[PDB]
Amino acid sequence: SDAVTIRTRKVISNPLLARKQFVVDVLHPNRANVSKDELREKLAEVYKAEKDAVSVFGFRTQFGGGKSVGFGLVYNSVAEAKKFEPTYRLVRYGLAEKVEKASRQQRKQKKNRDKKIFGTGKRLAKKVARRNAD
Amino acid sequence: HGSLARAGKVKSQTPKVEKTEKPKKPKGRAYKRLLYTRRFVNVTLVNGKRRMNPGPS
Amino acid sequence: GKGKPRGLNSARKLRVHRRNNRWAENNYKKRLLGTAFKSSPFGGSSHAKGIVLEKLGIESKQPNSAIRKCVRVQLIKNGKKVTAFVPNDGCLNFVDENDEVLLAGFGRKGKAKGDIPGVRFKVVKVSGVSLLALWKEKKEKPRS
Amino acid sequence: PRAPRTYSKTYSTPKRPYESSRLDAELKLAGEFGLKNKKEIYRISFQLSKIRRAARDLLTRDEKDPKRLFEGNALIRRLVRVGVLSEDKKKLDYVLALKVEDFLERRLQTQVYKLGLAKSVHHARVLITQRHIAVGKQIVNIPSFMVRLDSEKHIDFAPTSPFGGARPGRVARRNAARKAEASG
RNA sequence: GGAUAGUGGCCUACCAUGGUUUCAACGGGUAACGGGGAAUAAGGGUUCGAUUCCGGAGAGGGAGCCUGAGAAACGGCUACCACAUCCAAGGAAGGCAGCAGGCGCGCAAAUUACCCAAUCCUAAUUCAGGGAGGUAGUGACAAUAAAUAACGAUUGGAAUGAGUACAAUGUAAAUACCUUAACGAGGAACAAUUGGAGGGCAAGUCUGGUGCCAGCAGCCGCGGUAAUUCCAGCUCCAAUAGCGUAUAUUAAAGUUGUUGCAGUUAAAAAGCUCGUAGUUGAACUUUGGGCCCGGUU
């Protein structure tokens, strides 16, 4: 936006997770809100690092516009981000692919149906087919 | 005297008169302002005492 | 010596004297015996649904003169029959025979109001519809 | 489950609800401060009564008592920081001498009016609640915003508010568009 | 001596006759899980505590038991009782006081939703699982803030949020919130109700209707052809997104009285005396005086 002037406070480094973490406040006067991708690329350019290494989340807009205050996170590589950032954040940024887990109800129904069967069930299927066709 | 029937005689027989249309009254702080400007600068009601709803005399 | 014991070791005597004397209190005895649970028609309840058995005209007490409209309601939850007042003009015509009516207290705790003899309860809802709503035309009685 | 979320009431309705003198005094206050309900005066009087109870229990304590000193200096410090009290009357007895008018006068409504950004107190409340007035540099729409002693100097129109030099609102834009359409 | 993981009448054999009690035992009721605490209170106190935390107990009742360190385990078995389901009539399988949800009971209480993203938990264990938990839906239980309008001239401009909505933030993904393109005030609009106007308890000696009828009324009371009290209109008042009603409880209640009640006549001094428990019970035993030290003013 206009005069974003992205500031990063409390920039304590985190060698344990191989990242630099900071609270990021962006001032966007005369603007609704600045998008996640724009903030990610701006932080990457300002930190001289790859865009996929940086990550930002939990952006709370102050009352009446002007600025939003949130949390920032930049890693030491892209593999570090891929291994430490969670799956939802990775698919949010597009660096990963959303899993196709079935919904909880039908997943649990499948679990119960498989639990009620003992073994691989090949013998059960063969016996059932023989009895039904006979 | 004696009424087991005729219950609601007056409520049924009273001549209906509709609520006449009047300018909408303000609500909230506006109504508080109306009350203040009706009871503290319009103190002309005094006749020895301040009558809040004087009869049309 | 003002009758009551004053000794520094008379705490038991004071406690027991108070225990005996508290029974004379109207509300304390009622709560302790649980007459609300035992004997009161509502069983200590703020309201009670019932089925009206018949309409009644109860003459008002002196110096008043009028025929207050009432209903003989048998409570669904208790089976006790109580007289209930229909407290608004013309609202008696709303209540019919065998209509489910909600009963509430009359304000005076277990007593009667003014010139009504022996009526301690009043109707609030008829077949789930409020008496004042039916009176002021805000609702329409299903009559089903 | 989750630990209970504690809450409290900010006022206390008075006994004998129907005193003519009390009603007249509270309506005087409401009319001359733009208060929407008696609840606002009730809340202000409840805060006053709470701090006065604390002040009386504090004055009951012996002088130079550690608790007395700590709580008294804290109370007067917060009072002067709010601005309800004044710097000259830094003693504790002036907390007792306080009236509800001081708290009602330290509100954002009346402080906007005193600063002069408003035609009336009601105009001040209207401007406050339409996100036009902004303390410091942030929009606030709280009529009862207790202004600090370093905030009245920075009370002014909001940067986003059309009266604060921003885009001229919506009705002005609509009428300007209508005028341009007619003149076209 | 057995039994226990272990002490122990926990059980067993022999022996003595003991143990509790008017300082309230035993028995009965509890609409009684206990507590941290809640409401209301000058001080004392009164009432409540099913319920977010701690400790108990239960899985329809009751007992027995396997496994296991840990169970009298019930989303583990065994039997009976009471329910209740599918049978092809020989058989078989259950315990929602978990989550939703249905019936019943009632005055009384929500969706058969999404997710392991947090807080944690478990397993072989970073990865899986978790109706634990979180999110959303219903939700005037209660709490916080606060729109229903402001100004100008004698009819006009200017502002805005409700309500939509590209977008982004938000989130596990979302809904809403915070922001914001654009749309979105002039009244018949974008319309605030709930109770009340004889007194306590401020607010009508206004009009029409009724005429001890209807009816109102917490209490006193109003109403029988001039209703300040009923039903309507207008006006006004109190509170106000809340207001009223019923029940219970607290203050008021010095009407529970230890603080702090009353007993001649209002309710109350037993007919009188004796007397155990209980409560209370005359004084007297080391004082006064000198010399210093060290604290605060």
Swiss-Prot record, chain A:
Annotated signal peptide: none
InterPro entries from the UniProt entry: eRP_eS24_sf (IPR053709), Ribosomal_eS24 (IPR001976), Ribosomal_eS24_CS (IPR018098), Ribosomal_uL23/eL15/eS24_sf (IPR012678)
One term of GO molecular function: structural constituent of ribosome
Region (Disordered): 101-134
Pfam families: Ribosomal_S24e (PF01282)
Record keywords: Acetylation, Cytoplasm, Isopeptide bond, Phosphoprotein, Ribonucleoprotein, Ribosomal protein, Ubl conjugation
Assembly: Component of the small ribosomal subunit (SSU). Mature yeast ribosomes consist of a small (40S) and a large (60S) subunit. The 40S small subunit contains 1 molecule of ribosomal RNA (18S rRNA) and 33 different proteins (encoded by 57 genes). The large 60S subunit contains 3 rRNA molecules (25S, 5.8S and 5S rRNA) and 46 different proteins (encoded by 81 genes).
Family: Belongs to the eukaryotic ribosomal protein eS24 family.
Biological role stated in the UniProt entry: Component of the ribosome, a large ribonucleoprotein complex responsible for the synthesis of proteins in the cell. The small ribosomal subunit (SSU) binds messenger RNAs (mRNAs) and translates the encoded message by selecting cognate aminoacyl-transfer RNA (tRNA) molecules. The large subunit (LSU) contains the ribosomal catalytic site termed the peptidyl transferase center (PTC), which catalyzes the formation of peptide bonds, thereby polymerizing the amino acids delivered by tRNAs into a polypeptide chain.
Gene that encodes the chain: RPS24A
UniProtKB/Swiss-Prot annotation, chain B:
GO cellular component: a single term: cytosol
Modified residues (Phosphothreonine): 44
Residues with the Phosphoserine modification: 12
InterPro entries with a match to the protein in the record: Ribosomal_eS30
Keywords carried by this UniProt record: Cytoplasm, Phosphoprotein, Ribonucleoprotein, Ribosomal protein
GO molecular function, one term: structural constituent of ribosome
Main location per the UniProt record: cytoplasm
Any one GO BP annotation for this protein: cytoplasmic translation
One Pfam family this sequence matches: Ribosomal_S30
Compartments reported by the entry: Cytoplasm
Span list, region Disordered: 1-31
Subunit relationships: Component of the small ribosomal subunit (SSU). Mature yeast ribosomes consist of a small (40S) and a large (60S) subunit. The 40S small subunit contains 1 molecule of ribosomal RNA (18S rRNA) and 33 different proteins (encoded by 57 genes). The large 60S subunit contains 3 rRNA molecules (25S, 5.8S and 5S rRNA) and 46 different proteins (encoded by 81 genes).
Other remarks in the entry: Present with 37600 molecules/cell in log phase SD medium.
Functional note: Component of the ribosome, a large ribonucleoprotein complex responsible for the synthesis of proteins in the cell. The small ribosomal subunit (SSU) binds messenger RNAs (mRNAs) and translates the encoded message by selecting cognate aminoacyl-transfer RNA (tRNA) molecules. The large subunit (LSU) contains the ribosomal catalytic site termed the peptidyl transferase center (PTC), which catalyzes the formation of peptide bonds, thereby polymerizing the amino acids delivered by tRNAs into a polypeptide chain.
Family of the protein in this entry: Belongs to the eukaryotic ribosomal protein eS30 family.
Protein name in UniProt: Small ribosomal subunit protein eS30A
From Swiss-Prot, chain C:
Keywords: Cytoplasm, Hydroxylation, Isopeptide bond, Ribonucleoprotein, Ribosomal protein, Ubl conjugation
Domain of life where this protein originates: Eukaryota
Main location: cytoplasm
Entry-annotated residues carrying 3,4-dihydroxyproline: 63
Cross-link (Glycyl lysine isopeptide (Lys-Gly) (interchain with G-Cter in ubiquitin)) at residue(s): 55
Pfam families: Ribosom_S12_S23 (PF00164)
Post-translational modification (record): Hydroxylation at Pro-63 affects translation termination efficiency. The stereochemistry of the 3,4-dihydroxyproline has not yet been determined.
An annotated Gene Ontology molecular function: structural constituent of ribosome
GO CC terms: cytosol; cytosolic small ribosomal subunit; ribosome
More details: Present with 10600 molecules/cell in log phase SD medium. There are 2 genes for uS12 in yeast.
Function of the protein: Component of the ribosome, a large ribonucleoprotein complex responsible for the synthesis of proteins in the cell. The small ribosomal subunit (SSU) binds messenger RNAs (mRNAs) and translates the encoded message by selecting cognate aminoacyl-transfer RNA (tRNA) molecules. The large subunit (LSU) contains the ribosomal catalytic site termed the peptidyl transferase center (PTC), which catalyzes the formation of peptide bonds, thereby polymerizing the amino acids delivered by tRNAs into a polypeptide chain.
Protein name: Small ribosomal subunit protein uS12A
Encoding gene (name): RPS23A
UniProtKB/Swiss-Prot annotation, chain D:
Tagged with keyword Amino-acid biosynthesis: no
Function field: Component of the ribosome, a large ribonucleoprotein complex responsible for the synthesis of proteins in the cell. The small ribosomal subunit (SSU) binds messenger RNAs (mRNAs) and translates the encoded message by selecting cognate aminoacyl-transfer RNA (tRNA) molecules. The large subunit (LSU) contains the ribosomal catalytic site termed the peptidyl transferase center (PTC), which catalyzes the formation of peptide bonds, thereby polymerizing the amino acids delivered by tRNAs into a polypeptide chain.
Subcellular localization: Cytoplasm; Nucleus, Nucleolus
SMART domains named among the record's database cross-references: Ribosomal_S4, S4
Family affiliation: Belongs to the universal ribosomal protein uS4 family.
Upper taxonomic lineage: Eukaryota, Fungi, Dikarya, Ascomycota, Saccharomycotina
Glycyl lysine isopeptide (Lys-Gly) (interchain with G-Cter in ubiquitin) crosslink, residue number(s): 179
Residues carrying Phosphoserine: 183
Quaternary structure note: Component of the small ribosomal subunit (SSU). Mature yeast ribosomes consist of a small (40S) and a large (60S) subunit. The 40S small subunit contains 1 molecule of ribosomal RNA (18S rRNA) and 33 different proteins (encoded by 57 genes). The large 60S subunit contains 3 rRNA molecules (25S, 5.8S and 5S rRNA) and 46 different proteins (encoded by 81 genes). Interacts with snoRNA U3. uS11 interacts with MPP10. Component of the ribosomal small subunit (SSU) processome composed of at least 40 protein subunits and snoRNA U3.
A GO MF label: structural constituent of ribosome
GO (cellular component) term, any one: cytosol
Keyword flag Nucleotide-binding: no
A Pfam entry, by short name: S4
